[PDB]
Design a protein around this ligand. Structure first.
Ligand SMILES: Nc1ncnc2c1ncn2[C@@H]1O[C@H](COP(=O)(O)OP(N)(=O)O)[C@@H](O)[C@H]1O
Ligand SMILES: [Ca+2]
Ligand SMILES: [Ca+2]
Ligand SMILES: [Ca+2]
Ligand SMILES: [K+]
Length: 994
């Protein structure tokens, strides 16, 4: 732990006692651990209090039912009667459903938090350090790094600790530190000290803060602080719900229930009005108050009844549930909307190298010049063996194992590979395998030279550790790397300025070794090295080279090709300005071509398959790579993006070709084209932006820093577990699995959550509308009431709860991933659905009245008021308007009423069997598809039985009943709801639109 960033490199180096180039001794490490602990934070625990999670109150339509319970608790406090209890049950028929939803939500959210922390804490964060026990850089669990030791970090890496920069390898080091200082753009660094021991972070321009990202370049430094003593480790705890808000679908439904408060609140105040004429009726005596409170009670209870108090929970739930599922497919969701947004995606843009392909690169072919004579050019081709980055394998000409150092071309070739190279290898002892350190393209090279072994170095007697870099090291001892012109994606090449090693001879030849994309480099070559010789680059020579490149690119191996050339006579260091990266290309001119390497880079298994599924789901998949257009197109084909034979000149463009088009033509180009090549980061962004200008939901997949902009501009960015931190930081989802499939599953889930939301809404609406059709039909048809306050609270508690919340666990529709994606601005409720909402609610409203009616009329154990209702109800006093006054006051019988309440429950528990699927028959999507649903129904049906037979209970509600017949009736009335929907589903099916 150093308190200084205001000291020099040495002071700091000596402070811990380290060799800036070698790193801490196994004993210094064992010690600093003991003295400084591991590089991490305690945390890892409770991200939400068991009680916090409970605040699945505080929402919209939950506060309503919350308050409706208060009033029914005050009214019960001011209620005098020998019936001082049916009023205390009320507040618990309301609280009850609220509680039930609360638990499920809470349960679902806890399981998700867990599942996630599982995925996260799975793959350990690794670090790059120089340590004494190894000559080359090695990778250690970041948790293990301690103050003092030497850390290396480069473009795209995440700073693993708080670090004092020692040496900046690239011409410039650019770091992104938004997570800390809040500075929006990348900032510059230097190795000079900053005196002021008070200075703020923003000014510590010689430090790298653990948790920032390197946006550009590469550097080595010495670790000042670890763990909690970290600039970002202190500030963790400190508040701010910087955790976003609600998802667009969450905000869509939030508003739908808001204006359902209106429609409902009105229909309520309505009931209070449509009656209040029964303000005097003998029932509540006739008081100038006892009649408006009863009906005020019927309103509130009708409200609680209609209001989908489960809506705010079920989204939340489906959400956390979708999350938990992705988490299980090794997908990390960084931003809640992602899965939903993903659901309705039309276009999936994707990087090639490393995203579409495995990024496991090996050099397997290479070539130099053989003979150059007039229009004749010939090449020395070679083959390499070994698919991994292991330094085991052999070079082969004509199937014969050749000794690389035998060909002068291959010597320089190797020299260049070794020297123009920011990456290295490292052998993982635990896993027992050679792992790259830096970019794969570069590392492939490193491996190549370990296989070339041109100076026939003795290696057979070297540990699996030393054998990794041995040769390269040799080459490294042979020249001094003065500085390097970092690889830049515009010029698409990279160079290295070198002088003679021991300084044996000064001015005997300074060099620049160059490595880059063939086309550009070859254009910058004036000469062609022939062994030790050199001759002018000519037409025929070039053509020969390029043509073999073309061959290898489009070949059945789709080789990823790089060119190596040297500048024999560089400018003097004094003439070279390293300030503007722009002038580097010139510094890389008048080159001498040396040779070409063909890299192997396998497409991922699951990719072709995922592409298909997208094609069926109506989803466009576009490739946006920096790589060569020929190679790229080749690969699209292998990936299924293009047919093995197919003219693509109209649908595949290079950044250059693309930029040549007029703006208009660019916009359109995006619509038809599926392959963009040799494109800079800006292009990747622009292409998405275009897709977006068609009001479409665009997805961007990638792994590298040239992907960030597009990753960031898309609706969802999906990063690779393998890819850069930079790339991850700009993503909503991260495939740790690196599995491409998950993307598709991810779109299937958001398709589903939506469908689930719909059916929920369908059941709540069509049912609860029936419930209000019940009332506004009897009270208007001049019929005796069908339900009382606590009778409504019951049809509620028992059909607006777990049976509904259960729809959340509906399976995917059978066609879900077979129809085009939903426009995001689509009317939540279609016109044709409102009809179906009504046609169901209507039939529910009436079948519930005709049942109470039927009890009055055709019930063989009831009276027989036959058709007409015998006209009316106005037959109070004995033999009143004598129209067969053979009965007294059967107009208070608890039977006609429980008759309806019983049907309501049942007919509702029926069209919830209709909310398995939008438009699929129970013949295709049967009830057992959703088991969680069935248990809920039985749960409710059971609650209804209890209420009807546990003697103390029918008092508090209404008189029991039904033995066969009476129940068989409820059934005869309710069951047809299923027949009506199953025809209604027939309609919208054998006439389609969605
Ligand atoms: N580290 C590097 N140094 C020099 N040249 C390199 C390099 N890594 C990549 N190249 C060349 O730059 C070209 C474009 O790189 P880029 O757009 O970043 O990704 P990609 N799919 O093309 O590899 C590559 O196709 C490659 O030939
Ligand atoms: Ca309700
Ligand atoms: Ca890439
Ligand atoms: Ca209901
Ligand atoms: K984004």
């Amino acid at each position: 732990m150093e308190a200084a960033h205001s000291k020099s490199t040495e002071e700091c180096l000596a402070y811990f006692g380290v060799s800036e180039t070698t790193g801490l001794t196994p004993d210094q490490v064992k010690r600093h651990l003991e003295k400084y602990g591991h590089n991490e934070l305690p945390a890892e625990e409770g991200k939400s209090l068991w009680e916090l999670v409970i605040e699945q109150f505080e929402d919209l339509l939950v506060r309503i039912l919350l308050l409706a319970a208060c009033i029914s608790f005050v009214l019960a406090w001011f209620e005098e009667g020998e019936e001082t209890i049916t009023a205390f049950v009320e507040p618990f028929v309301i609280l009850l459903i609220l509680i039930a939803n609360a638990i499920v939500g809470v349960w679902q959210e806890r399981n998700a938090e867990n599942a996630i922390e599982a995925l996260k804490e799975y793959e350990p964060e690794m670090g790059k350090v120089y340590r004494a026990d190894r000559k080359s850089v090695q990778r250690i669990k970041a948790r293990d790094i301690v103050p003092g030791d030497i850390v290396e970090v480069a473009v795209g890496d995440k700073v693993p600790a708080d670090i004092r920069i020692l040496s900046i390898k690239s011409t410039t080091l650019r770091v992104d530190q938004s997570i800390l200082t809040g500075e929006s753009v990348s900032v510059i660094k230097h190795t000079e000290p900053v005196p002021d021991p008070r200075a703020v972070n923003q000014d510590k321009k010689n430090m790298l803060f653990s948790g920032t990202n390197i946006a550009a370049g590469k550097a080595l430094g010495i670790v000042a602080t670890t763990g909690v003593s970290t600039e970002i480790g202190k500030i963790r705890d400190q508040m701010a719900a910087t955790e976003q808000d609600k998802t667009p679908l969450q905000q869509k439904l939030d508003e739908f229930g808001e204006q359902l408060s209106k429609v409902i609140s009105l229909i309520c105040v309505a009931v209070w009005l449509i009656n209040i004429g029964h303000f005097n009726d003998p029932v509540h005596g006739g008081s100038w108050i006892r009649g408006a409170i009863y009906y005020f009670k019927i309103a509130v209870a009708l409200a609680v009844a209609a209001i989908p108090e489960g809506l705010p929970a079920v989204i939340t739930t489906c959400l956390a549930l979708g999350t938990r599922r992705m988490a299980k497919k090794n997908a990390i969701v960084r931003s809640l909307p992602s899965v939903e947004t993903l659901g309705c995606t039309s276009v999936i843009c994707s990087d090639k190298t490393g995203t579409l392909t495995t990024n496991q690169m090996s050099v397997c072919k290479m070539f130099i010049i053989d003979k150059v004579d007039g229009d004749f050019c010939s090449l020395n081709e070679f083959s390499i063996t070994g698919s991994t980055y292991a330094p085991e394998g052999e070079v082969l000409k004509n199937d014969k194992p050749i000794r690389s150092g035998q060909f002068d071309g291959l010597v320089e070739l190797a020299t260049i590979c070794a020297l123009c190279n920011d990456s290295s290898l490292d052998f993982n002892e635990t896993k027992g395998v050679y792992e790259k350190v830096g970019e794969a393209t570069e590392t492939a090279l490193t491996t190549l030279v370990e296989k070339m072994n041109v100076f026939n170095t003795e290696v057979r007697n070297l540990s699996k550790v030393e054998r990794a870099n041995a040769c390269n090291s040799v080459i490294r001892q042979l020249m001094k790397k003065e500085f390097t012109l970092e690889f830049s994606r515009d010029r698409k090449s990279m160079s290295v300025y070198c002088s003679p090693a021991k300084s044996s001879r000064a001015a005997v030849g300074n060099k620049m070794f160059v490595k880059g994309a063939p086309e550009g480099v070859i254009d910058r070559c004036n000469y062609v090295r022939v062994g030790t010789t050199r001759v002018p680059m000519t037409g025929p020579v070039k053509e020969k080279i390029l043509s073999v490149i073309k061959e290898w690119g489009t070949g059945r191996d789709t080789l990823r090709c790089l060119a190596l050339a040297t500048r024999d006579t560089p400018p003097k260091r004094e003439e070279m300005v390293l300030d503007d990266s722009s002038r580097f290309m010139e510094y890389e001119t008048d080159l001498t071509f040396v040779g070409v390497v063909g890299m192997l880079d396998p497409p991922r298994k699951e990719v072709m398959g995922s592409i298909q599924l997208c094609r069926d789901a109506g989803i466009r998949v576009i490739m946006i790579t920096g790589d060569n257009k020929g190679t790229a197109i080749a690969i699209c084909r292998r990936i299924g993006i293009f047919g093995e034979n197919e003219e693509v000149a109209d649908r595949a463009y290079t950044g250059r070709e693309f930029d040549d088009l007029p703006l208009a033509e660019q916009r359109e180009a995006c619509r038809r084209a599926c392959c963009f090549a040799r494109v800079e980061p800006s292009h990747k962004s622009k292409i998405v932006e275009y897709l977006q200008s068609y009001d479409e939901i665009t997805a961007m997949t990638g792994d590298g820093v040239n992907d960030a902009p597009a990753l960031k501009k898309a609706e969802i960015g999906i990063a690779m577990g393998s890819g850069t931190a930079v790339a991850k930081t700009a993503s909503e989802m991260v495939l740790a699995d690196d599995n491409f499939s998950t993307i598709v599953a991810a779109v299937e889930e958001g398709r589903a959550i939506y469908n689930n939301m719909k059916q929920f809404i369908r059941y709540l609406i069509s049912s609860n509308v029936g419930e209000v059709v019940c009332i506004f039909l009897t009270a208007a048809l001049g019929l005796p009431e069908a339900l009382i306050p606590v009778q409504l609270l019951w049809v509620n508690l028992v059909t607006d709860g777990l049976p509904a919340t259960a729809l959340g666990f509906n399976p995917p529709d059978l066609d879900i991933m077979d129809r085009p994606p939903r426009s995001p601005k689509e009317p939540l409720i279609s016109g044709w659905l409102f009809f179906r909402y009504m046609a169901i609610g209507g039939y529910v409203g009436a079948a519930t009245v005709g049942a109470a009616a039927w009890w009055f009329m055709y019930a063989e154990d009831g009276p027989g008021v036959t058709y007409h209702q015998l006209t009316h109800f106005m037959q109070c006093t004995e033999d009143h308007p004598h129209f067969e006054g053979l009965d007294c006051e059967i107009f208070e019988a608890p039977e006609p009423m429980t008759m309806a309440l019983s049907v309501l429950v049942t007919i509702e528990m029926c069209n919830a069997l209709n909310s398995l699927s939008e438009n699929q028959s129970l013949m295709r999507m049967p009830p057992w598809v959703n088991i969680w649903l069935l248990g809920s129904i039985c749960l409710s049906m059971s609650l209804h039985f209890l209420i009807l037979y546990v003697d103390p209970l029918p008092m508090i509600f209404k008189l029991k009943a039904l033995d066969l017949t009476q129940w068989l009736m409820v059934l005869k009335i309710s069951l047809p709801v299923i027949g009506l929907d199953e025809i209604l589903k027939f309609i919208a099916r054998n006439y389609l639109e969605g």
